[PDB]
Write a protein that binds this ligand. Structure first.
Ligand code: O92
Length: 833
């Protein structure tokens, strides 16, 4: 430790937003043991990575180029437009043409160190991929637009340079509980419930005598459990809870990171229930020693299946993730564990049929996992892998075969799944996990991944006390290997975000909950932005939410505070790239008031749904806008260009306190389209994007939305906003949407029939991926909600995806829902005030 060493570590702390060397809220070694453990995987990935592919991070896919999109290539021909200083020049090109081939199919069209970069962006077309297999290229095809690439020097890889670095039964003594003040109620009773717990399966449970609820309550009882010390499984948690009814909980790992039984005296500060949630499982103690309840404790311690059994089995094995097993189901899985091993899809259920509190069963479990050829030969099924990483599996061997599968994800697919894999770190018993390290590896290997990993981790560190220490240790590890270049770049973004976040807080307080932005507010705002430009603010920052774009200077006069109780800022920037082919603006909405973690989670489910749709050649035209959560009820949102809310459209030549008429959306649509062509391209886009959002939202159960929360672009693209947030309609298909499709008001249309057609296609696309959608929704709820039912809330999607139907029963169902919305026209829209 020099200065040096510590100098650098001070930078890290501000990048993270947490001090990982602080050891004042720990009662053991684990965290520091993870900092040192993560050194090896990091270095291995630094040492092993390609310097120039790392510096240029092509964003590519191995996936087939969809039916739509080929249908946008005419004569096996793709036009690319190079640029050198003031010169341009197109180049006709073939789908399979590697960027190296294209570059010389240009030098022959009349040295080595020139790269095919994108205009506007830190985005290279490089490495050995058919151009059609770069994502920027596919963005340009889907979107009707031309590919523009500058010709310049390949970024110096030197900038990315990484810095030099017993058969006794188990018992617990419950000494007592202490809390500086209760005043919440007068009196009542309290007991401590101590649960021995594995994969949220309670192994044993004892409680204390009840006693009067006073500021200090002492017991001081040995609670003897039914289980032997030797049958405690690794990852087993002492769960300690205070009831009246549940008020407080905390957990202690019975077995530690060094495989030793937790021995000794503990005073543990607890988390308060504020009224099935990832938070409940944390091995972290509450850092607030002042206001917190504490508890103190001492630890002193080959055959042939009856054709119809086999079909019993296969029916169990073919049932959904949320289908409960019975004692019988479990005994059948376990008894026929080797038969079950032949089915990859049985793995979750088979592992839930294990008695984890028996050492000899656990051992037999390990013996069957040594026999892992069927699993290792199986194609990655992400949904099934995801299930083994959720709250029901606390065993490291089980969780580690799940991660093993994830190893073959391409980078493109990591990115689809990144937020939910970061969130899944919360179901890990230990800080250092095969999952922790896979995310670490994948981040260091790819800058795009590594950038989102930063903000994903940072979002949790800034607002999860339960989980911020774990996530900070993993973030530090990332940061000590991403390169001083990336480090430089994160520092800047944090700098800007902090600056811009003060301004949105300051400005909010100034405005009352009254629907008016006062002269002197927009005055106050314009002021700070100048008083900040113009100080203060970096010459240019990378847009988080979109790491290719770089923002430069604000456009003070386009900036404003938004017609919302939340008073978000609407900021606009000049794009610091001269080579950019527009002068369109980079818009970021900063907002305090909403939990944008919920938005993130939903938005990422929606990108996934679009990939599901792509595999079956459907484009439902979602606009899943960028949205980075930054701290407690605060963060950033992407401004969609030429977009207007659907409430604002209705409050037209009409006006305010009334009333909703069925055209207007159509007029606005023609009003906005320069040619009757463009109009029709818009009505088309509307039928698709409409369909996508009705399926998506019905499945996620977030369909009943008010139309100030539904937007549309000038080109017909519908999109829901503010997921926020939190008589029944299944989705928002109002008369004004129908008109545009062309069916006032109980008939059929060429375009309604199409809409109905597209919904049915896309719905059925999703149910093919039913098990994947269900695990995502279930983790979503556990790691990003208020409270959620370990039956009914999660089970919504089961019923939405119409599990255990044929394609017929389902098409019916969805067309039924389409109707409910038509039968109710404007009811629920009006029902708002
Ligand atoms: C009026 N809003 C817009 O024009 C707009 N809104 C968004 C947007 C997307 C998601 C969310 Cl969650 C939001 S917001 O609810 O936080 N901001 C907002 C502020 C004033 C009025 C609104 F209707 C808003 F949605 C806004 C994106 N691009 C846009 N062009």
């Amino acid at each position: 430790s020099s200065e040096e060493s510590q100098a650098f570590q001070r930078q890290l702390t501000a990048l993270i937003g947490y001090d990982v060397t602080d050891v004042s809220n720990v009662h053991d070694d684990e965290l520091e043991f993870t900092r040192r453990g993560l050194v090896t995987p990091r270095m291995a990935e630094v040492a092993s990575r390609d310097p120039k592919l790392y510096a240029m991070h092509p964003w590519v896919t191995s996936k087939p180029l969809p039916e739509y999109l080929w249908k946008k290539i005419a004569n096996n021909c793709i036009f690319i437009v190079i640029h050198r200083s003031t010169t341009s020049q197109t180049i006709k090109v073939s789908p399979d043409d590697t960027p190296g081939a294209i570059l010389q199919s240009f030098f022959t069209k009349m040295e080595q160190d020139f790269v095919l970069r994108v205009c506007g962006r830190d985005e290279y077309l490089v490495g050995e991929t058919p151009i059609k297999n770069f994502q920027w290229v596919r963005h340009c095809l889907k979107n009707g637009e031309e590919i523009h690439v500058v010709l310049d020097t390949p970024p110096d890889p030197a900038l990315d340079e990484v810095r030099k670095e017993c058969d006794r039964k188990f018992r617990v003594k419950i000494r007592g509980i202490d809390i500086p003040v209760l005043p919440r109620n007068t009196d009542l009773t309290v007991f401590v419930e101590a649960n021995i717990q594995h994969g949220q399966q309670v192994l044993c449970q004892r409680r204390t005598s009840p006693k009067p609820f006073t500021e200090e309550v002492l017991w001081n009882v040995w609670l003897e459990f039914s289980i032997k010390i030797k049958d405690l499984p690794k990852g087993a948690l002492l769960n300690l809870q205070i009831y009246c009814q549940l008020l407080y909980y905390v957990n202690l790992l019975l077995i530690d990171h060094r495989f030793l039984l937790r021995r000794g005296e503990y005073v543990l500060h607890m988390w308060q229930i504020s009224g099935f949630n990832a938070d409940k499982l944390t091995s972290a103690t509450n850092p607030d020693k002042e206001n917190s309840m504490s508890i103190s404790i001492l630890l002193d311690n080959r055959a042939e299946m009856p054709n119809q059994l086999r079909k019993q089995l296969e029916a169990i094995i073919a049932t959904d993730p949320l289908n409960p097993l019975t004692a019988e189901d479990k005994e059948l899985l376990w008894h026929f564990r080797y038969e079950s091993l032949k089915h990859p899809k049985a793995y979750p259920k088979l592992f839930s049929s294990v008695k984890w509190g028996q050492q000899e069963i656990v051992a037999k479990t390990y013996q069957l996992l040594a026999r892992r050829e069927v699993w290792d030969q199986s194609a990655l099924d992400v949904g099934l892998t995801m299930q083994l990483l959720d709250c029901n599996f606390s065993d490291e061997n089980v969780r580690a075969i799940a991660v093993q599968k994830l190893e073959s994800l391409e980078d493109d697919d990591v990115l689809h799944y990144l937020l939910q894999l970061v969130q899944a770190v919360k179901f890990e018993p230990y800080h250092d996990s095969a999952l922790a390290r896979f995310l670490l590896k994948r981040g260091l290997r790819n800058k795009r991944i590594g950038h989102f990993l930063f903000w994903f981790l940072r979002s949790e560190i800034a607002q999860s006390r339960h989980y911020q220490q774990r996530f900070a240790v993993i973030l530090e590890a990332y940061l000590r290997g991403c390169g001083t270049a990336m480090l430089h770049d994160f520092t800047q973004q944090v700098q800007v975000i902090e600056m811009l976040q003060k301004v949105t807080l300051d400005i909010k307080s100034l405005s009352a909950e009254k629907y008016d932005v006062s002269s002197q507010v927009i005055s106050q705002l314009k002021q700070k932005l100048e008083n900040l430009q113009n100080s203060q603010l970096p010459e240019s920052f990378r847009v988080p939410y979109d790491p290719g774009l770089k923002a430069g200077a604000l456009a003070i006069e386009k900036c404003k505070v938004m017609a919302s109780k939340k008073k978000p800022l609407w900021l606009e920037f000049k794009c610091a790239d001269p080579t950019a082919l527009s002068n369109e603006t980079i818009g970021i909405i900063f907002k305090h008031g909403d939990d944008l973690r919920q938005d993130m989670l939903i938005l990422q489910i929606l990108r996934i749904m679009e990939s599901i749709w792509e595999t079956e050649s459907l484009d439902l035209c979602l606009l899943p806008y960028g949205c980075i959560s930054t701290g407690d009820k605060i963060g950033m949102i992407e401004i969609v260009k030429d977009a207007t809310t659907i409430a604002k459209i209705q409050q037209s030549t009409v006006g305010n306190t009334g009333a909703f008429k069925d055209e207007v959306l159509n007029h606005w649509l023609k009003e906005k389209s320069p040619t009757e062509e463009k109009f029709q391209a818009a009505v088309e886009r509307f039928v698709y994007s409409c369909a996508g959002y009705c399926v998506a939202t019905f499945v996620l159960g977030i369909g009943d939305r008010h139309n100030d929360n539904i937007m549309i672009t000038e080109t017909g693209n519908l999109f829901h906003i503010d997921f926020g947030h939190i008589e029944r309609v299944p989705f928002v298909l109002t008369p004004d949407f129908l008109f545009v499709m062309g069916t006032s008001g109980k008939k059929t249309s060429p375009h309604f029939q199409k809409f109905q057609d597209i919904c049915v296609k896309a719905y059925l696309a999703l149910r093919h991926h039913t098990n994947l959608l269900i695990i995502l929704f279930s983790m979503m709820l556990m790691t990003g909600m208020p409270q959620l039912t370990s039956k009914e809330d999660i089970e919504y999607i089961r019923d939405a995806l119409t599990v255990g139907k044929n394609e017929e029963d389902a098409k019916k169902y969805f067309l039924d829902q389409i109707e409910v919305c038509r039968d109710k026209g404007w009811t629920v829209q009006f029902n708002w005030f």
